[PDB]
Amino acid sequence: VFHKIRNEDLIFNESLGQGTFTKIFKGVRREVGDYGQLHETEVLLKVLDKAHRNYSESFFEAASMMSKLSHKHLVLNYGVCVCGDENILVQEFVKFGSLDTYLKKNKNCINILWKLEVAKQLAAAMHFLEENTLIHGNVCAKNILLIREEDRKTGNPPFIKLSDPGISITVLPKDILQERIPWVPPECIENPKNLNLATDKWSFGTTLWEICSGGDKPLSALDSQRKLQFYEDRHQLPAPKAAELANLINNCMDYEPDHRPSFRAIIRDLNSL
Numbered sequence: 163v164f165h166k167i168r169n170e171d172l173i174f175n176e177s178l179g180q181g182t183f184t185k186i187f188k189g190v191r192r193e194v195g196d197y198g199q200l201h202e203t204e205v206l207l208k209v210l211d212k213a214h215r216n217y218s219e220s221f222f223e224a225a226s227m228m229s230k231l232s233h234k235h236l237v238l239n240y241g242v243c244v245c246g247d248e249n250i251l252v253q254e255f256v257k258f259g260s261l262d263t264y265l266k267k268n269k270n271c272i273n274i275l276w277k278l279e280v281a282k283q284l285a286a287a288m289h290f291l292e293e294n295t296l297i298h299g300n301v302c303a304k305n306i307l308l309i310r311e312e313d314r315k316t317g318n319p320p321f322i323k324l325s326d327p328g329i330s331i332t333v334l335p336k337d338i339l340q341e342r343i344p345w346v347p348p349e350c351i352e353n354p355k356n357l358n359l360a361t362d363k364w365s366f367g368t369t370l371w372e373i374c375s376g377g378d379k380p381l382s383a384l385d386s387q388r389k390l391q392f393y394e395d396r397h398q399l400p401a402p403k404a405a406e407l408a409n410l411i412n413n414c415m416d417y418e419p420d421h422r423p424s425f426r427a428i429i430r431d432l433n434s435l
């Protein structure tokens with residue numbers, strides 16, 4: 163179950179953007195913490211749109227997935243506020259935001275070793291989920307958060323976490339699914355109920371492509387009809403700018419889901435460079 167947070171202990175501050183049928187805000191939670199100390203803690207507030215309240219079950223199931231498992235590379239959920247009409251998910255607030263924006267802002271500053279450390283961390287998180295037979299269903303650079311920047315001076319690497327998947331692709335309208343090509347794998351375009359552990363290996367490949375492309379979005383120039391035809395013609399993504407991980411990307415985005423490598427194998431490949 164989810165810890166219930168009182169509407170009166172939450173303050174909503176600035177809008178940070180939107181997700182799928184959600185609005186996202188920075189906020190503050192008043193709480194009693196360890197030793198009975200009172201705290202005013204920064205939080206990330208995710209609000210399901212009133213118009214799409216019929217998705218509330220999938221909205222919360224997405225975060226519940228993340229919450230029943232504990233791992234260093236998985237975002238922390240603090241609880242939920244159903245107080246009122248609103249359906250509110252309360253999560254930890256990460257200092258440096260999402261990776262897709264960070265890659266773009268810091269293009270001329272991110273080198274191959276940084277990308278490899280990030281890829282290894284994401285692969286570790288996905289290996290944990292695979293070993294627990296937990297499907298994420300929406301692996302992408304927008305859903306990777308940057309906790310700590312790299313510090314060459316101290317030799318410290320960056321540190322990321324994987325966020326929750328949001329409303330599942332098994333209940334979303336087809337036009338949203340099509341726009342999410344090529345993160346959504348071909349078999350889930352055929353039938354979103356084909357969502358499986360193999361789904362996440364495909365999307366991991368798409369996310370590595372993002373990491374290697376300075377925050378470009380693959381196939382963004384293609385409209386939804388042309389994205390569908392891309393899958394129907396069995397195309398692959400072009401090798402990124404920095405081509406060091408192109409082979410791994412292509413091996414991961416295999417049109418045969420049963421041939422996509424395990425995350426253990428993926429980690430072995432990453433460690434070999």
Ligand SMILES: CCN(CC)C(=O)c1ccc(Nc2nc(OCC3CCCCC3)c3[nH]cnc3n2)cc1
Pocket residue numbers: 178179180181186206237253254255256257258259260307325
């Ligand atoms: C000055 C420019 N920056 C970057 C430095 C910021 O303003 C910024 C934005 C967000 C955070 N933190 C954040 N972001 C999340 O999601 C990512 C956001 C979701 C919806 C909109 C896009 C971003 C989160 N999810 C779950 N805990 C989160 N914490 C930190 C800083």
